[model samples]
Target: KSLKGSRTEKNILTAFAGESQARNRYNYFGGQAKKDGFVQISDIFAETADQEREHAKRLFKFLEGGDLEIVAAFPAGIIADTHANLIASAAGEHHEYTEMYPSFARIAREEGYEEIARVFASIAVAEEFHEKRFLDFARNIKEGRVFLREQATKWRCRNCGYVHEGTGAPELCPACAHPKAHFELLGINW
Candidate 1:
């Protein structure tokens, strides 16, 4: 993609806005956590998203600095509210995690470097939560608990999505593998 002139200005602004949005959202949730003291598992769970949101801020900067000028334009009205927005963000993370991030994860695995996978897996879990968190909300809006029902519909374990950080257990069942044959259901609860 080639940049012309002010057209690139809009692209820069869009990239800037992405980083700004992540920063704001991370702060928004992190503030709540700090006020509450984040006392339990759920609190820890929530913090995960904020952390990934921060990483996304950096990644957006990298991409914008790299090349996005000729690829796409700033979409209109991509307001970060609503169940749909939450679900969309969650669903879209597959591209980065299953595709982009795993490429790096493989090399790290081969090198016996656990920290690399740790960071990537943590962020991937954040994106996973973003999608699943909204399932409960989406269920409330709909007639039935369609959100929960859909959890097993496209189980991530079907393919090699991620590698374990430590033991490297079960070879590769993907979707944060464990040796257990029957993993717990996902969706809505994560």
Candidate 2:
């Protein structure tokens, strides 16, 4: 195989794993939104979730391009309170944006895989957007009194599991040096 134990292989696998996780998460989140009476949000999540699964499948096909029966297996995540889940989701995206994808892109370029590098670059940007979206909920809960139309929220730092209640996520997580962007909104009101 062209990627038995190489950086190229690693990045492809990692990206696939991330995509796969996102697909499942979005589906679950969509259900949560639907349950909470947010029909529009639920529909969008379901649609995007399906698309994410397709993206993962496409990536898997790319891995099999060398006539190799690419058998792929990867880790996944479990659900929690929607807010906590959002925090985890945001943190995962932030990692992909700031570190994971960037590192992969670098290796891809060094290996002269221009197209692969471009994919990594594009994904990094997309991950950041996801991070920001999740952050909106996280920040809201941390910055102001928990006051959602239907639910309340709390927050936690991604770098460290330090938890915090309303009035803003700390500028810097006290337990870890990760920045504010690293904090995820916990799915809690009290």
Candidate 3:
């Protein structure tokens, strides 16, 4: 079947728009995290924001035409603090993986757009990982564990990649002096 007037095609555009917005929002959140002195968390947000841009690019490849009116609503309002933003990011990722993309994939499959369905499904999996990472970050912030560790562990400076073995991150990176917030816990699966 042709994709000219298909629901799958509109879904592709909608998903692309969503990914684009998410990329910007995450970038903004990263800026807030940096201002709040959570440099490692800011780096994570920047990383995820770039991945969102990649997702947008992948979805953009599915577009075949001029233009169509798409009805969609995006999150709005002022940005929250780092912790609240992390929680919100996790919630949005959870929604994408558990509700939005799953429905989109199912619709694409029903419309005989198997390749599109596959794309949606794979992106959903990525979103699941994003949800997990954001949730873990939020929990670490809440529990005061972002830089503190129970036992001796390896901490990597996000600025210079220097590794330190200690119960807590150094006040400043030994190699680059970027600050404690630039050091992140290493070897944890997130």
Candidate 4:
């Protein structure tokens, strides 16, 4: 009752919006995978899409039985291409990790809501992984290496988490200079 107009209330609503959008975005990715004839990959996207939606559901549950409604929409829509999509996704994740969640966590902390602060902090960390993954995908697109017959290939540097651009899998990660053995195929459609 006392949280009706509180900062915590606003952050919860923000989280609801973010998670809802992420779910829909994952669903779109699944559709794209299916379009590209990656059935198994599509299934993976589909599974994650469900999980993302579940996150939204869980966020909604935090409304304390109150009707959670969106008063503002998160900016979301189709990007032009796969590489562009990956870049955009990375940007969104970066924003969340660097700015959005950090600000939310600060506000929650100032509001004396330690639990809420922790949630935002944890989300920030999660976003870091997402950002890195998308960046790796983007690097794969940049490389001419094929995942499937001339499909631009992608490699993930296990050593430094750097996704390197290469034709035959890089001899080493430029980011960390790790050997070719340190890089692993991430598969690529772009």
TM per candidate comes to: 0.37, 0.59, 0.94, 0.67
For model 3, residues 69-153, the per-residue Cα lDDT tens digits are: 8998888845899999999999889889998899999999999999989989999999999999999999999999989989999
Ranking by TM-score: 3, 4, 2, 1
Worst 10 residues of 4 by lDDT: 144-153
Please state the error at residue 92 of candidate 4 in Å. 1.3
lDDT of 3: 0.91
Candidate 1 lDDT (Cα, 0 to 1): 0.42
Candidate 4 off by > 4 Å: 37-51, 65-73, 146-190
As for TM-score, the candidate ahead, 1 or 2, is 2
**Model 2 per-residue lDDT tens digits across residues 55-81:** 577567657444323354433556655
Q: Best-fitting candidate, measured by TM-score?
A: 3
Ranking by lDDT: 3, 4, 2, 1
Stretches off by above 4 angstroms in model 2 are 1-5, 65-76, 139-190
CA lDDT of each prediction against the hidden true structure: 0.42, 0.65, 0.91, 0.66
Per model, state how many residue pairs clash: 0, 5, 0, 1
